[PDB]
Amino acid sequence: MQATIYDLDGNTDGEVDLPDVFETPVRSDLIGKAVRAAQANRKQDYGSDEYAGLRTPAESFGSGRGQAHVPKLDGRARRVPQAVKGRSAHPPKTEKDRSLDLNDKERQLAVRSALAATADADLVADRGHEFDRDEVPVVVSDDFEDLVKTQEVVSLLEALDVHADIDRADETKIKAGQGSARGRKYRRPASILFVTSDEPSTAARNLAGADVATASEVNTEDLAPGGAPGRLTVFTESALAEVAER
């Protein structure tokens, strides 16, 4: 198909062929499996102290005093799981493998498939993104990689009728639950992914909900956050070309 290239003013400036991969049949099940793994693979091993509740010589009096055979020390029950201050019967364990494997092929196929869902304006709209454009992904001249101010990327985005998505991500949610106590107080919608070629866009990164990636290592997660296909993306002339062989 055809890809309408845009200049830093938001005006058409020729067009390149949309590489084949963007024709890869969208497979949300495979994409979901790729995200699930990436999300599990960064989780940290945890678990209670091996000896928590075992540091005591408590013993059971056995039969004879009208008491249950529960280990006690200084007339206080201990160790056993039903006892306050006792061990945890089946606790979290450091030894547990909390990682998920995934065949390279299966994962690469998901990458290609997520790439392809990027070229479907309907999917992109269903995923939730706000925009008033018909073509997608949004391809742009390699000059984008030279921008330096966030504000400049804003103008370009407004010119491309895509800034509305950032308006969407411009709202943080204060989550329900104790995550807050561990530093996960906030969360926010995912907006535009900017795929460049030489280096992530320093100029676009701070944009509400924006994520910056590079064509050689852009993955399933940035292409389909949370395993949902169809993220409103903006590639770079050269980015678009590199992505082709992924």
Partner 1 sequence: SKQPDKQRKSQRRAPLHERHKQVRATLSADLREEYGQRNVRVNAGDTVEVLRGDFAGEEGEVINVDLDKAVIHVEDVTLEKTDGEEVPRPLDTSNVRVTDLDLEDEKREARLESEDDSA
Partner 2 sequence: SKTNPRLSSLIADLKSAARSSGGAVWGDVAERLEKPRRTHAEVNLGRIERYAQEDETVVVPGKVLGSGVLQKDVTVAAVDFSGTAETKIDQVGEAVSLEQAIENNPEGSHVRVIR
Partner RNA sequence: UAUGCCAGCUGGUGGAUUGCUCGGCUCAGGCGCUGAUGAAGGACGUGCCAAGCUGCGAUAAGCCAUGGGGAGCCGCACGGAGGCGAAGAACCAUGGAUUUCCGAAUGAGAAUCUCUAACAAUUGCUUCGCGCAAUGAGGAACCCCGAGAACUGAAACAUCUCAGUAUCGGGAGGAACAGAAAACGCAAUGUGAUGUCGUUAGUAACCGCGAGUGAACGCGAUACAGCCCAAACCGAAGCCCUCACGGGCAAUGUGGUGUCAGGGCUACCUCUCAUCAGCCGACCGUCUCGACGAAGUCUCUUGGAACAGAGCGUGAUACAGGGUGACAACCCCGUACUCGAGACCAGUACGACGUGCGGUAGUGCCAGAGUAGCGGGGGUUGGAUAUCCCUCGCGAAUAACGCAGGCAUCGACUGCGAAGGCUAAACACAACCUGAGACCGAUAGUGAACAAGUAGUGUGAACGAACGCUGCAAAGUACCCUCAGAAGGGAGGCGAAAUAGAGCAUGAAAUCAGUUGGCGAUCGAGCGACAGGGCAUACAAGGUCCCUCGACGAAUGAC
Partner RNA sequence: GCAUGGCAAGUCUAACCGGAGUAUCCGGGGAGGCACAGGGAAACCGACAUGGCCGCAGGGCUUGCCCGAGGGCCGCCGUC
By the criterion CB under 5 A, which residues form the site for Na ion?
A: 45, 55
Q: Which residue sits closest to Mg ion, CB atoms considered?
A: 53
- Site track 8-47 with partner 2 (rule: CB under 8 A), x = hit: -----------------x-xxx------------------
Segment interacting with partner 1 (CB under 8 A) among 96-104, 174-182, 213-221, 238-246 = 174-182
What's the token pair of residue 95? 């030894």
Tell me how far, at minimum, the Cβ of 236 lies from partner 1, in Å. Answer: 31
Task: Rule CB under 8 A: say whether 25 interacts with partner 1.
Answer: no
Smallest CA-to-CA distance from 148 within 97, 199, 106 is with 199
**Residues between 197 and 216 with contacts to RNA, criterion CB under 7 A:** 199-200, 202-203, 205-208, 210-214, 216
Q: Which helix (H) or strand (E) holds 187?
A: strand 186-187
Binding mask 60-89 for RNA (x = CB under 7 A): -------------xx-x-x-----xxx-x-
Q: C-beta of 29: minimal distance to partner 2 in Å?
A: 5
**Which ranges in 4-102 belong to alpha helices (H)?**
28-40
Name, in order, each residue with C-beta under 8 angstroms of 67's C-beta and a sequence gap of 6 or more.
61
Which of the residues 185 through 214 are near partner 1 (CB under 8 A)?
185
Element (H, E) at 12: strand 12-17
Least Å distance, CB 241 to partner 2, is: 25
- Bridge partners (DSSP) listed for residue 193: 211, 233
**Binder among 20, 49, 59, 161 for RNA (CB under 7 A):** 49
What is the DSSP secondary-structure string of 118-137? TT-HHHHHHTT-----SS-S
- How many residues bind partner 2 (CB under 8 A)? The answer is 4
CB burial of residue 229 (10 Å; 0-12, 13-18, 19+): buried
Q: What would the x/- binding string for partner 1 be over residues 128 to 167, using CB under 8 A? A: ----------------------------------------
To which H or E segment does residue 107 belong?
A: helix 104-117
Between 61 and 186, name the residue whose CB sits nearer to partner 1.
186
CA distance 84 to 77: 7
Take residue 139 and report the two structure tokens written for it: 């391809």
Binding site for partner 1 (CB under 8 A): 180-183, 185
